[PDB]
Amino acid sequence: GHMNNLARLEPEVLSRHAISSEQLGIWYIQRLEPTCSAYNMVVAFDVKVNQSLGNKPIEILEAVMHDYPLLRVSMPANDQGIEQLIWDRVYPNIIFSDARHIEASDLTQLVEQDTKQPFDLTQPPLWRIHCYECGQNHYVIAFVIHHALMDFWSIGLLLRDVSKRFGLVAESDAVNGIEFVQYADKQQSSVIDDTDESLIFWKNALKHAPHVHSIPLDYPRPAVQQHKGSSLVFRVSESVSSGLVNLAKDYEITLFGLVLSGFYVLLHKLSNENNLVIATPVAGRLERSLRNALGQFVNTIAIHMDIDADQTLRQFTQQVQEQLRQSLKHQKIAFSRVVEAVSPKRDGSINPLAQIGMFWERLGGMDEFKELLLPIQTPATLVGQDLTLGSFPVRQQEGQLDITLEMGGEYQGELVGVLKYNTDLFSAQSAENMVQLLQAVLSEMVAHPERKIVELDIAPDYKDGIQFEALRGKATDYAQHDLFAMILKQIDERGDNHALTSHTVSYRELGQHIAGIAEYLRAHGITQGDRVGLMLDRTALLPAAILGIWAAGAAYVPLDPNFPTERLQNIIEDAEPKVILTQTELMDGLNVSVPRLDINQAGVVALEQVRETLAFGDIAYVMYTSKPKGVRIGHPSIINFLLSMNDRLQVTTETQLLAITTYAFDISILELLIPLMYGGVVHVCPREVSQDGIQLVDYLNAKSINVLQATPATWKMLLDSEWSGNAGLTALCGGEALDTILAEKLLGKVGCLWNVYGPTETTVWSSAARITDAKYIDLGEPLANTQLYVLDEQQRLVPPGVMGELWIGGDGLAVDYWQRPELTDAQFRTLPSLPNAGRLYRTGDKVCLRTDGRLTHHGRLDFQVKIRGFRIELGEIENVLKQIDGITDAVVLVKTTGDNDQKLVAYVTGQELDIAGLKKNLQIHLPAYMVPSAFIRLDEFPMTANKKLDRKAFPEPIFEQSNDYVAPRDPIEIELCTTFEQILSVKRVGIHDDFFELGGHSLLAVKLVNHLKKAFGTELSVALLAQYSTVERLGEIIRENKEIKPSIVIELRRGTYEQPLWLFHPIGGSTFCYMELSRHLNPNRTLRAIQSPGLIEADAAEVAIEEMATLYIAEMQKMQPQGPYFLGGWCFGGAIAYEISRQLRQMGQQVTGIVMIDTRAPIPENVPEDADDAMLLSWFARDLAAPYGKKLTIPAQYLRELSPDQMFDHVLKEAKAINVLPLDADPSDFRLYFDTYLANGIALQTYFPEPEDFPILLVKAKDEQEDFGESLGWDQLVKDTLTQVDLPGDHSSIMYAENVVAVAQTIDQMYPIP
Ligand SMILES: CCCCCCCCCCCCCC(=O)OC[C@H](COP(=O)([O-])O)OC(=O)CCCCCCCCCCCCC
Ligand SMILES: Nc1ncnc2c1ncn2[C@@H]1O[C@H](COP(=O)(O)O)[C@@H](O)[C@H]1O
Ligand SMILES: [Mg+2]
Ligand code: NI
Known part of the structure; x- marks a missing residue:
């Protein structure tokens, strides 16, 4: 054993002290998440020794522990406060392990693992030393100090003093290891009244600061922060580094000033928000009496910049430097105190007020050690007579915020920086991106110092004219092919095989029907270029009619008979068709001034006899969509679309497609034609069957289908029925966002699954994703002759990882909006930004360009997903609800309330539900800011005629403003209430009032918990109170617990x-x-x-x-x-x-x-009068509710009619129903x-x-x-x-x-x- 001659003895407390307010915050975080290692400061060294070192290390260690009391400190939480205890003696925690058998790569990982082991700040010491034997007289030494105990300035003083003791440097300044408790004490004899001019400054500074930043995340944000993270080390080039120094001097600013300004600009471009909050450390050592003291003096300040994209860099950078200069005037006010005063909504998913930091540290006086303290490895050593020190870099203090930029170091002319990133929020690829973007900002800053912030573009020199080559589609000549010829070829080749199945039609018969309809139309006035209204039922004539209308040279305008008559009538008004092809029943349904042809009167005609006369025209159809917007689509789009689709589907003679979509929805084009292009069979599914879960499941098992296309609605319907799946089926899901739940469900039931996307204006679909893993859903990659661009509001190309508006170019564009040229000119454009792109459709879709080439969808711009500043991932809320047993489907919307305030509303459907418990479930799986303010149950969600969710149709929510007062209902709630009232000094606390909203803040929570585990006699924690902040919710947790009697x-x-x-x-x-x-x-x-x-x-x-x-x-x-x-x-x-x-x-x-x-x-x-058991029970019921001012009248005569057990159940049920017993009250209770x-x-x-x-x-x-x-x-x-x-x-x-x-x-x- 390496500590054989140190010996363990019984320590006693020398003195009790306060903790400084600078320590309180870090202490609280450590106590809130006990496995947190984000404040484990590590400094480590490669150590080679000589024989002459001897027992000096223990000798020196013992000397240092004696000299600096701060090293013998504990921070226990006691009655009405946290204390700083100085122990007479502490057994050092020194760990020595054999690493002689470990490759150098692995040894680093190991040291990083070892130093992350969490501290208990109430059991001394709050530091430890890790040693590794690497070879003979060769060790790695890692020193680990918890940041609650001391700061990095302190680490410096110790490093230099202990180095001298080992004879590595000649001189060391005097170190004071006792001043801090004095400083702590004199501090906590002072008020900081809410009138303090500095405190007022921060309130003003941060009042209008957002709850959480709007940088897009890679992952969904955990409800409770786990401080996991990683670090990315990078260097800024000598050219750009020198540039920055000079540029700073060419303004009137700190280098730090400059780089911080750089950072804001980066976050501005990354999140596209103009309100940004970055947190910076300050040394907090203004009083020179402190400059030699060991202690934790560092305070955090939250700088809140308002970005004016119109500002020049020069104007803006200075604007930062100034605000920074003002803020440093008020650094005395602790961040914990600022959070108290501002009183933001507490949310266990984020750090209050600020989730991005920037640390800038250079630390002078550490001249011999400067290279030994860099994030990078250096050949620099300190040679002493007994030992040599050497660089041993280890990742440390990861997980503090969402992102922290750590800079100040310089090495061989290059600025050295560390990007720290939360690994639950960001992927490594995103971190690299951020570094690359940061690098780009600093370059473009020294390059163009006078440029307006908005005109500055961070984004990669997209020299190809594309953001990724993925986002450009395979180039072909598909749009030149003849669709009619293909179908004619199949008609010759396939012969008497099946084509359609409604009373089965052969390919030969189909050819006859096309001829007959085309001829009928021709005979009755129809010419190339005309438009034919098409009002049919889902028969075998439907695909024949489409092809007939085409062969007559005409375009068809869908008039689905199931749509509302006024809707049909509006289309007919706008489209001005020459006739309407319909069936006999439907001839005089509509009151329109437009001729009608009974398609049943069209004969059959041998194709041979009228083939010379049959040609497609330029326009294929006018399809209407959400005044009426008829999109006009030409045949070269359609053939480009179909061929590009065959490339994926590999349609064959044995293909068999169940067509279910209305022909008044363009995606029906695929279902009705593409088997006919290759000899396969189209199954025209009757409307009743497609709208009935079991009836559809039936037709699937029978008729032996292997391709199916539908919107999510149909797939949900199918899954909600006992559908056994089909492992040969190729499935396409489109029209609407594929959420991860449906995806994981579809995957287990289907052979191949495609997410498929596209607006009507670019012809059915524009891109497609082969979905294989539900956790990774996106819009896929382009169809042939299609290009995808993600543009900003300036129609510039976006940087990777940034949200923008999707624009589509290619052979798929519509011809126009039918007789709406101004609209067409506005929606179909060429862009100066993309001069080789040609004509482009502007989707109005919100799409994030990932660091990947992946396009993820975030839904429209007409839809408000913004609240109080920050933006909401509505889908992530939906995903959680759906996982709740009972819920079949959920939709979450942002809705407005009274004074231009926005709130989340969640709509759910399901077999059996309890709205009450929904909010409690979501609370423990989502961030606070993503928890819906309202839950509305529906029987069925409103659909469009297309079978998509009709969001506009969901009922407007009615919000309860204030929370309803409810008096505590049992001894636990009663005590809890009194306890809340007393600590918060609130006259009367209801069981639904939330601790922090009542004025509670973090230090109070600690008091509260301490008061409680005396009052209840069990171990309660500040995490419990954090997650359960109401008497009701907290009462439940306590109550469930069988190990706690009041x-x-x-x-x-x-x-x-x-x-x-x-x-x-x-x-x-x-x-x-x-x-x-x-x-x-x-x-x-x-x-x-x-x-x-x-x-x-x-x-x-x-x-x-x-x-x-x-x-x-x-x-x-x-x-x-x-x-x-x-x-x-x-x-x-x-x-x-x-x-x-x-x-x-x-x-x-x-x-x-x-x-x-x-x-x-x-x-x-x-x-009292003599009472039978019923009467007594009746009385009890009365006396139970009376104290609450409620009359609970349960007649003894009613009670006598029941059995005894029925009686108690009845009273219990009745008492609960007027809320004088807790909701979870067992009969036992x-x-x-x-x-x-x-x-x-x-x-x-x-x-x-x-x-x-x-x-x-x-x-x-x-x-x-x-x-x-x-x-x-x-x-x-x-x-x-x-x-x-x-x-x-x-x-x-x-x-x-x-x-x-x-x-x-x-x-x-x-x-x-x-
Ligand atoms: C948090 C502040 C605490 C300050 C404490 C002052 C420094 C004391 C370092 C104590 C390390 C004790 C390790 C030990 O006893 O092992 C002796 C070891 C040989 O062991 P064995 O194989 O003979 O059993 O032989 C060795 O491995 C010796 C290695 C010596 C390393 C000296 C490091 C000098 C740099 C000081 C930097 C301080 C930064 C805060
Ligand atoms: N796979 C998909 N994922 C997300 N949105 C889609 C998908 N397919 C279509 N859409 C949306 O549906 C819209 C259809 O237009 P509208 O009929 O006006 O709702 C498109 O413009 C897209 O925004
Ligand atoms: Mg559309
Ligand atoms: Ni040992």
Whole structure:
């Protein structure tokens, strides 16, 4: 053993101190997430020794521990505060392991693993040393200090002092290792009132600062931050580094000033937000008396820049330097204090106020060590007589924020930096991107110093004219091919084989039907260029009609008969068709001034006889979409589309496609034609079957389909039926976003799955993704002769990792919007930015260009996904809901409320649901900012005629503004409430009020938790309180826990006066009736109330009052062993007080007085009427709810009709339904209440004390209708010493807020305290 001669001894505390406010925040984070290593400071060395080193290391270590008290510090959390304890002695935590067998690559990983082991800041030491034997006289030494204990400036002082001790440097400055606790103490004897001019500065600085930054993430953000992260080391070139130095001097700014400005500009371009908040450390060592002190002095300041893209870099950089200069005036105010004052919404998913940092450190005086402290390895050594030090870089302090930029170092003319990134949010490829973008910003800054921020472009020199070569589609001549010729060829070749299946039509028969329809049309006025309305049912004539209309030279305009007549009529108005091809039934359905042809009258004609006359025209169809927008599509688009689709689907003679989509939706083009291009079979699915889950499942298992295309809706319908899947099926899902849940479900049921995307204006689909893993969904890669561009609002190309608007170019563009040329000219453009792109369609889709060539969809621009600044990943919320058992489908929308405020609304459908528990579920899987403010259940989500979700149709939500007040309903909620009220100084806390929203803040939480694990006697944590911030939610957690029984004593108020007032429970056993009283009593008096054991442990309620009283007096005396006692109670509690007084005086104790609030004297006359079990249960139900001002009337006669077990269930169900029992109350819990009621009843019936003269304040409820005498009987027990006051109220309401104030004040006037 390497510590054989150090020896372990028993440490004792020398002195207690405060923690500085600079330590409080880091301490709290460590206590909030115990496995956090993000504040493990590491400095490590390659150490070669000589024989002469000897035992000097232990000798020196022991000397250093003696010299600097700070190293023997612990930070335990105690009563009403966190403490800094200096121990006389600490056993050093030195770990020595054999690494002689470990390759150098692995050794680094190992040291990084080892140093991340988390500290408990309450068990010393808060530092440790890791040694590795690498070879003989060859070691790696890693020193690890928790940042709560000291800062890097301190590390420097130690490094230099300890180096001198080992004889590595000649000189060392004096180090002070005791000043910090003094500094801590003098600090926490000071206020920082909310009037402090610096505190006001930060509130103003940060008031309008966003909740969370809008950089797009790679992953979905965890509900609770786990501080996992990684680091990327990079260097800025000598050219660009020198440039920066000079540019800074060519302005009036710090180098740091410059680079920070660079950083903001980067985040501006990355997130496209103009409000940005970056956090920077400050040394916090202005007082020179501190410049040699070991300690944690570093404060964080949150700089909040407003970016004006119109600013020149020069103007803007200076604007930063200035604000930075102002902010440094107010660095004295701790970040924890700023967070307290600003009071942002607490959210366990992010750091408050700021999630991006920039550290700039150079640290002078460390001249010999400068290269030994870089993030990169250097040949630099320190040679001493006994040993040599060498560079050993290890990744350290990862996970603090979302992103932290760490800079200040320089090496061989190059600025050295470390990009730190949270690995739960960002991929490594994204980090590299960020570094590359950062590099680009600094270059373009020294290049073009006078340029306007907006005109500055970070994005890669896309020399090819494309952002990635993926986003450009394979070049062919598909758009030149003849579609008609292919189908004609198949008609010759395939012969009498099947073609359509509705009454099966052969290819030969199909040719006849095309001829016959085309000829019929020709005969009745139709020519090339005309437009034919097409109003048909899903028969075998449908595809024949399309091809017939085409062969006649005409274009068809879909008029689906299932669409609303006024919708059909609007299209017909706009499209102005020459005729409408329809069937016999439908001829005079529409009231339109447009001729109609019964397609059933078209004959069959031999194709041979009319082939010369058959040609396609230029236009294929006019398809309408969301005034009416008819998109005109030409045949070269369509043939380009179909051929490009065959490339993927590999359509063959044995292909068999179930066509289900309306021909009034362009994607039907694929389903109706592409088998006919290759000899396969189109199955025209009848509308009824496509809209009926089981009926569709049936037609699938039967007719042996191997290709199916549909929108998500149909797939969901299919899965919601008992569909066994089809492992040969090729599936296409398009038209709407494929969420990860459907994807993982589809994948397990289908052979091949395609996500397929495209607007109508670029011909069915433009791109397609072969989906293989649900966690990776995107818009795929382009079809042939198609190009995809992601542009900003300036129609410039975006940098990778940035969101923009998708634009599409290629052979797929529409001809135009039908007779809407202004619109066409606005939507179909060439762009100066893309001069080789040609004509482009502008989708109005929000698409993120990934660091990958991947396009991920984020849905439109007309749809608001912004709230309070930051933006919402609506799909991530939806994904969670769907995973909840019961929920079948969910849609989350952003909606506006009253004063231009936006809130999340979640719509759900499902078999059986409990809206109540939904919010609690989401709370523990999403960030706070992504939790919906409203849950609306629907039977079915509204669809479009296309079978997509019709978001515009979802009902507008109605928000509950304030949270409804609800009084605590059980002993746990009762204590929790009192505890909240007291700590927050809030007069009255409801069980749905949230700790932090009531004014709570992080240091208070620690107090609260400390108060609780005394009051409950178990280990509660600040994480629990963080995640469960309401009495209700927290009550649940505590309650579920079988290892925690409360005390029968509740402190309602700790006052200053010596003497407590003790209150005793009424018949029910609870102390709720005293809560409101306690709020109006003079707060200088301590109040304690006792509840029955019976409410906590089973069969524990006492049944004789005399025994009850003894038990309670013992409980009392543990807190108040002597003095004269002050007792009282409402109702039965008064009688308990009477008997307690009797026993107290038999013990020689004095009783100052008894408060009785409408107590009926314990005399025979006042005993209740005899009740059967039903009546007792009826009474209990009444008395249970009365304290809450609620009337719960359960007639004994109703109860007698039921069996006993049915009775208790009935009362329980009824009590819960008016909210006077917690929602999770088992029958077990209910028997606890009822049994206590029964016990106290029996006690009442057997208690009849002899007369006795105690000083009694009898407060009579002067409005109670039941008669018990002027004195409620007390004149028979107490003659001379009874003071009676009659006050407004009845026996119950006397204790209600309106009436109980006068009760409280009667007491305070009668039993005064200074
Ligand atoms: C957090 C502050 C604490 C300050 C403590 C002062 C430095 C004390 C370093 C103590 C390391 C103890 C390791 C040890 O006892 O092993 C002796 C080892 C040979 O062991 P063995 O194989 O004979 O059993 O032989 C060796 O491995 C010797 C290695 C010596 C390394 C000296 C490092 C000098 C640089 C100081 C930098 C301080 C930075 C904060
Ligand atoms: N696979 C897909 N993923 C996401 N959005 C899609 C997909 N396919 C189509 N869309 C959207 O659906 C729109 C159709 O236009 P509209 O009929 O006006 O809703 C397109 O412009 C796209 O925004
Ligand atoms: Mg569309
Ligand atoms: Ni050892």
